[PDB]
Chain A
Amino acid sequence: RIRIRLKAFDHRLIDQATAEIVETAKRTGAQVRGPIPLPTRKERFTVLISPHVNKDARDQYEIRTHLRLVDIVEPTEKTVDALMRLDLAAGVDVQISL
Protein backbone atom coordinates (compact mmCIF):
# COMPACT_ATOMS: atom_id res chain seq x y z
CA ARG A 1 0.00 0.00 0.00
CA ILE A 2 2.48 2.66 1.27
CA ARG A 3 4.97 -0.06 2.33
CA ILE A 4 8.28 1.86 2.22
CA ARG A 5 11.76 0.33 2.73
CA LEU A 6 15.12 2.17 2.48
CA LYS A 7 18.83 1.38 3.09
CA ALA A 8 21.64 3.70 4.32
CA PHE A 9 25.34 3.10 5.15
CA ASP A 10 26.13 5.64 7.91
CA HIS A 11 25.02 5.17 11.56
CA ARG A 12 22.86 8.33 11.25
CA LEU A 13 21.76 9.38 7.72
CA ILE A 14 18.20 8.09 7.19
CA ASP A 15 17.13 9.11 10.77
CA GLN A 16 16.65 12.72 9.51
CA ALA A 17 15.22 11.61 6.11
CA THR A 18 12.73 9.19 7.76
CA ALA A 19 11.97 11.94 10.35
CA GLU A 20 10.91 14.55 7.75
CA ILE A 21 8.65 12.04 5.90
CA VAL A 22 6.67 11.47 9.19
CA GLU A 23 5.68 15.13 9.92
CA THR A 24 5.02 15.58 6.17
CA ALA A 25 2.51 12.67 6.36
CA LYS A 26 0.97 12.88 9.89
CA ARG A 27 0.37 16.68 9.81
CA THR A 28 -1.60 16.81 6.53
CA GLY A 29 -2.99 13.24 6.88
CA ALA A 30 -3.57 10.94 9.87
CA GLN A 31 -2.36 7.67 11.50
CA VAL A 32 1.33 7.15 10.35
CA ARG A 33 2.58 4.46 12.77
CA GLY A 34 6.27 5.39 12.34
CA PRO A 35 9.80 4.22 11.39
CA ILE A 36 10.40 0.56 12.39
CA PRO A 37 14.18 0.15 12.99
CA LEU A 38 14.61 -3.39 11.44
CA PRO A 39 17.75 -5.64 11.59
CA THR A 40 21.05 -4.18 10.29
CA ARG A 41 22.99 -6.59 8.05
CA LYS A 42 26.76 -6.03 8.51
CA GLU A 43 28.97 -7.49 5.75
CA ARG A 44 32.39 -8.07 7.39
CA PHE A 45 35.49 -8.42 5.15
CA THR A 46 39.08 -9.28 6.15
CA VAL A 47 42.12 -8.99 3.83
CA LEU A 48 45.92 -9.04 4.11
CA ILE A 49 47.43 -5.66 5.07
CA SER A 50 50.88 -5.97 3.33
CA PRO A 51 51.52 -6.84 -0.39
CA HIS A 52 54.03 -9.60 0.59
CA VAL A 53 53.83 -11.97 3.66
CA ASN A 54 52.73 -10.38 7.06
CA LYS A 55 49.51 -12.46 7.43
CA ASP A 56 49.71 -12.16 11.27
CA ALA A 57 48.68 -8.48 10.88
CA ARG A 58 45.41 -7.89 8.97
CA ASP A 59 43.03 -4.91 8.81
CA GLN A 60 39.37 -5.84 9.37
CA TYR A 61 36.67 -4.14 7.27
CA GLU A 62 32.87 -3.76 7.67
CA ILE A 63 29.86 -2.27 5.83
CA ARG A 64 26.70 -1.68 7.92
CA THR A 65 23.36 -1.67 6.02
CA HIS A 66 20.74 0.25 8.08
CA LEU A 67 17.06 -0.43 7.21
CA ARG A 68 13.93 1.65 7.95
CA LEU A 69 10.17 1.08 7.38
CA VAL A 70 7.76 4.05 7.63
CA ASP A 71 4.43 2.50 6.49
CA ILE A 72 1.83 5.30 6.30
CA VAL A 73 -1.57 3.70 7.13
CA GLU A 74 -3.62 6.61 5.60
CA PRO A 75 -3.56 6.73 1.71
CA THR A 76 -5.48 10.02 1.22
CA GLU A 77 -5.21 11.94 -2.10
CA LYS A 78 -4.25 15.07 -0.09
CA THR A 79 -1.33 13.38 1.78
CA VAL A 80 0.12 11.54 -1.29
CA ASP A 81 0.34 15.02 -2.92
CA ALA A 82 2.93 17.42 -1.41
CA LEU A 83 4.92 14.37 -0.07
CA MET A 84 6.65 12.89 -3.15
CA ARG A 85 9.73 14.82 -4.36
CA LEU A 86 10.57 15.99 -0.80
CA ASP A 87 13.04 13.05 -0.41
CA LEU A 88 16.09 15.32 -1.15
CA ALA A 89 18.04 12.12 -1.83
CA ALA A 90 21.49 11.77 -0.21
CA GLY A 91 22.13 8.49 -2.12
CA VAL A 92 19.61 6.35 -0.16
CA ASP A 93 17.60 3.86 -2.28
CA VAL A 94 13.86 4.58 -1.88
CA GLN A 95 11.61 1.56 -2.65
CA ILE A 96 7.77 1.36 -2.45
CA SER A 97 6.55 -2.29 -2.55
CA LEU A 98 4.90 -5.13 -0.57
Chain B
Amino acid sequence: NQYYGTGRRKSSAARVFIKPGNGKIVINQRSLEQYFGRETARMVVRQPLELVDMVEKLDLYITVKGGGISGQAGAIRHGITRALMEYDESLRSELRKAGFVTRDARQVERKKVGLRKARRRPQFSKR
Protein backbone atom coordinates (compact mmCIF):
# COMPACT_ATOMS: atom_id res chain seq x y z
CA ASN B 1 0.00 0.00 0.00
CA GLN B 2 1.04 3.62 -0.71
CA TYR B 3 2.12 6.08 2.03
CA TYR B 4 0.17 9.35 1.50
CA GLY B 5 0.41 12.91 2.91
CA THR B 6 -1.29 16.22 1.97
CA GLY B 7 0.20 19.44 3.45
CA ARG B 8 -0.40 23.00 2.25
CA ARG B 9 1.05 26.54 2.52
CA LYS B 10 -0.76 29.84 1.72
CA SER B 11 -3.47 28.46 -0.63
CA SER B 12 -0.96 26.00 -2.23
CA ALA B 13 -2.12 22.37 -1.84
CA ALA B 14 0.24 19.39 -2.40
CA ARG B 15 -0.31 15.60 -2.62
CA VAL B 16 2.76 13.64 -1.43
CA PHE B 17 3.28 9.87 -1.88
CA ILE B 18 6.09 7.72 -0.36
CA LYS B 19 7.25 4.14 -1.19
CA PRO B 20 10.29 1.86 -0.43
CA GLY B 21 12.13 2.28 -3.81
CA ASN B 22 14.60 4.71 -5.46
CA GLY B 23 15.30 8.39 -4.67
CA LYS B 24 14.45 10.01 -8.03
CA ILE B 25 12.26 13.10 -7.44
CA VAL B 26 9.11 13.33 -9.60
CA ILE B 27 6.96 16.50 -9.27
CA ASN B 28 4.08 17.19 -11.75
CA GLN B 29 5.79 14.70 -14.14
CA ARG B 30 9.09 16.67 -13.85
CA SER B 31 12.49 16.41 -12.06
CA LEU B 32 13.67 18.39 -8.97
CA GLU B 33 16.35 20.34 -10.87
CA GLN B 34 13.75 20.74 -13.69
CA TYR B 35 11.31 22.03 -10.99
CA PHE B 36 13.32 25.37 -11.17
CA GLY B 37 14.18 25.45 -7.41
CA ARG B 38 17.65 27.04 -7.53
CA GLU B 39 17.46 30.16 -5.28
CA THR B 40 16.29 30.38 -1.58
CA ALA B 41 13.64 27.72 -1.06
CA ARG B 42 15.80 25.37 -3.24
CA MET B 43 15.89 22.55 -0.66
CA VAL B 44 12.83 23.49 1.47
CA VAL B 45 11.13 20.54 -0.30
CA ARG B 46 13.80 18.34 1.44
CA GLN B 47 13.84 20.44 4.68
CA PRO B 48 11.81 17.74 6.53
CA LEU B 49 14.35 15.21 5.14
CA GLU B 50 17.35 17.24 6.53
CA LEU B 51 17.89 15.37 9.83
CA VAL B 52 17.22 11.74 8.75
CA ASP B 53 19.21 8.63 7.74
CA MET B 54 18.49 8.50 3.98
CA VAL B 55 21.36 7.93 1.47
CA GLU B 56 18.72 6.94 -1.15
CA LYS B 57 15.84 5.43 0.84
CA LEU B 58 12.41 6.05 -0.74
CA ASP B 59 10.40 6.62 -3.94
CA LEU B 60 8.65 10.02 -3.83
CA TYR B 61 5.85 11.29 -6.08
CA ILE B 62 4.51 14.79 -5.29
CA THR B 63 2.10 17.17 -7.08
CA VAL B 64 1.41 20.80 -6.03
CA LYS B 65 -0.83 23.52 -7.51
CA GLY B 66 -2.04 26.93 -6.31
CA GLY B 67 -0.04 29.91 -5.00
CA GLY B 68 3.47 30.80 -6.21
CA ILE B 69 7.07 29.55 -5.96
CA SER B 70 7.65 29.64 -2.17
CA GLY B 71 4.04 28.73 -1.26
CA GLN B 72 4.20 25.56 -3.38
CA ALA B 73 7.64 24.78 -1.85
CA GLY B 74 6.27 25.04 1.72
CA ALA B 75 3.29 22.86 0.68
CA ILE B 76 5.85 20.20 -0.34
CA ARG B 77 7.71 20.93 2.96
CA HIS B 78 4.58 20.36 5.08
CA GLY B 79 3.30 17.62 2.71
CA ILE B 80 6.29 15.28 3.11
CA THR B 81 5.98 15.49 6.96
CA ARG B 82 2.39 14.15 6.75
CA ALA B 83 3.68 11.40 4.39
CA LEU B 84 6.15 10.27 7.14
CA MET B 85 3.23 8.19 8.65
CA GLU B 86 5.17 5.12 7.33
CA TYR B 87 7.21 5.65 10.55
CA ASP B 88 3.92 6.53 12.46
CA GLU B 89 4.26 9.29 15.19
CA SER B 90 7.57 7.91 16.62
CA LEU B 91 9.79 10.09 14.40
CA ARG B 92 7.34 13.02 14.90
CA SER B 93 8.61 13.52 18.52
CA GLU B 94 11.92 14.89 17.14
CA LEU B 95 10.12 16.54 14.15
CA ARG B 96 7.93 18.56 16.62
CA LYS B 97 11.08 20.50 17.69
CA ALA B 98 11.86 21.44 14.05
CA GLY B 99 8.34 22.85 13.50
CA PHE B 100 7.75 21.39 10.01
CA VAL B 101 4.54 19.54 11.03
CA THR B 102 3.38 22.99 12.30
CA ARG B 103 0.96 24.32 9.65
CA ASP B 104 1.40 28.04 8.92
CA ALA B 105 -1.73 30.00 9.96
CA ARG B 106 -0.29 33.19 8.33
CA GLN B 107 -2.56 33.99 5.32
CA VAL B 108 -2.65 37.16 3.14
CA GLU B 109 -4.82 39.85 4.77
CA ARG B 110 -8.05 41.17 3.21
CA LYS B 111 -8.26 44.69 1.73
CA LYS B 112 -10.11 47.08 4.08
CA VAL B 113 -12.22 50.24 3.55
CA GLY B 114 -10.23 53.49 3.79
CA LEU B 115 -6.93 51.51 3.60
CA ARG B 116 -4.59 50.97 0.57
CA LYS B 117 -4.10 47.21 1.14
CA ALA B 118 -5.10 45.75 4.56
CA ARG B 119 -3.12 48.26 6.79
CA ARG B 120 -1.77 51.47 5.11
CA ARG B 121 -4.13 54.32 6.10
CA PRO B 122 -3.76 56.90 3.27
CA GLN B 123 -1.86 59.99 4.53
CA PHE B 124 -3.72 63.14 5.70
CA SER B 125 -2.95 66.80 5.11
CA LYS B 126 -0.85 68.55 7.83
CA ARG B 127 -3.05 69.05 11.01
- Let me know if A41 is at the binding interface, CB within 8 A: no
- Let me know if A42 is at the binding interface, CB within 8 A: no
Q: How far is the CA of A57 from the CA of B115 in the complex (A)?
A: 11
Interface of B is mostly: loop
- A12: shortest Cβ distance to chain B, in Å? 25
- Let me know if A3 is at the binding interface, CB within 8 A: no
* Chain B residue total in the interface (Cβ 8 A): 2
Residue of B at shortest CB range from A49? B113
**B113 neighbours in A (Cβ, 8 Å):** 46, 56-58, 60
* Chain A residue total in the interface (Cβ 8 A): 6
Q: 0/1 per residue, B106-127, Cβ < 8 Å to A? A: 0000000110000000000000
**A55 neighbours in B (Cβ, 8 Å):** 114
Residue of B at shortest CB range from A60? B113
Q: How far is the CA of A71 from the CA of B113 in the complex (A)?
A: 43
Q: How far is the CA of A55 from the CA of B122 in the complex (A)?
A: 13
Residue of A at shortest CB range from B121? A56
Q: 0/1 per residue, A34-76, Cβ < 8 Å to B? A: 0000000000001000000001111010000000000000000
Q: How far is the CA of A57 from the CA of B112 in the complex (A)?
A: 10
Partner-A contacts on B (CB < 8 A): 113-114
Give 8 A-B contacts (CB < 8 Å), ordered by A residue: A46-B113, A55-B114, A56-B113, A56-B114, A57-B113, A57-B114, A58-B113, A60-B113
List 6 tightest A-B contacts by C-beta distance, closest first. Answer: A56-B114, A58-B113, A56-B113, A57-B113, A55-B114, A46-B113
